[PDB]
Amino acid sequence: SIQAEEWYFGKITRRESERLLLNAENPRGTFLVRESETTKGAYCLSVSDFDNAKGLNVKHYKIRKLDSGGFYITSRTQFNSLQQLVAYYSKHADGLCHRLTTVCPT
Ligand SMILES: O=C(O)[C@@H](c1ccccc1)S(=O)(=O)O
């Protein structure tokens, strides 16, 4: 049950995810998973980042889910569940702006 996950914010917009993530108290990797605004069957991983050039900022990554079962941001790296995907990216930055750290406070 992905709806049961505390990091799943459901039906919130890209702008709302940015409002939540752009809080100065959020360290790099603060994140949430929400519905994609324009891709049916897809989710979006929103993550906070911070650097001396941009300061506090937010990146969004589309998560695809196959009818064949797999979940992925890049098709070369798939998972059997969204929970497994989140756990993997909490340990590996790979192409993300930062590894996933803490769930975005509301
Ligand atoms: O449509 C989407 O899933 C989202 C998205 C994610 C990354 C890039 C473009 C669009 S959005 O919900 O932020 O627009």
Swiss-Prot record:
PTM comment: The phosphorylated form is termed pp60c-src. S-nitrosylation is important for activation of its kinase activity.
Domain SH2: 7-104
Phosphotyrosine modification, residue list: Y43
Tissue expr: Expressed ubiquitously. Expressed in the skin (at protein level). Platelets, neurons and osteoclasts express 5-fold to 200-fold higher levels than most other tissues.
Subcellular location: Cell membrane; Mitochondrion inner membrane; Nucleus; Cytoplasm, Cytoskeleton
Origin: domain of life: Eukaryota
Family: Belongs to the protein kinase superfamily. Tyr protein kinase family. SRC subfamily.
Subunit structure comment from the entry: Part of a complex comprised of PTPRA, BCAR1, BCAR3 (via SH2 domain) and SRC; the formation of the complex is dependent on integrin mediated-tyrosine phosphorylation of PTPRA. Interacts with DDEF1/ASAP1; via the SH3 domain. Interacts with CCPG1. Identified in a complex containing FGFR4, NCAM1, CDH2, PLCG1, FRS2, SRC, SHC1, GAP43 and CTTN. Interacts with ERBB2, STAT1 and PNN. Interacts with DDR1, DDR2 and DAB2. Interacts with CDCP1, TGFB1I1 and TOM1L2. Interacts with the cytoplasmic domain of MUC1, phosphorylates it and increases binding of MUC1 with beta-catenin.
Function field: Non-receptor protein tyrosine kinase which is activated following engagement of many different classes of cellular receptors including immune response receptors, integrins and other adhesion receptors, receptor protein tyrosine kinases, G protein-coupled receptors as well as cytokine receptors. Participates in signaling pathways that control a diverse spectrum of biological activities including gene transcription, immune response, cell adhesion, cell cycle progression, apoptosis, migration, and transformation.
Miscellaneous section: May be involved in blister formation in Pemphigus vulgaris, phosphorylated-SRC is abundant at blister sites but not in normally adherent tissue, which corresponds with loss and disruption of CDH1 in cells adjacent to blisters. Phosphorylated SRC is increasingly abundant at pre-lesional sites of blister formation and occurs prior to changes in abundance of CDH1 and DSG3.
Domains as described in the record: The SH2 and SH3 domains are important for the intramolecular and intermolecular interactions that regulate catalytic activity, localization, and substrate recruitment.
Involvement in disorder: SRC kinase activity has been shown to be increased in several tumor tissues and tumor cell lines such as colon carcinoma cells.
Protein name as annotated: Proto-oncogene tyrosine-protein kinase Src
Species for this entry: Homo sapiens (Human)
Taxonomic classification: Eukaryota, Metazoa, Chordata, Craniata, Vertebrata
Entire-sequence positions represented here: 145 to 250 of 536
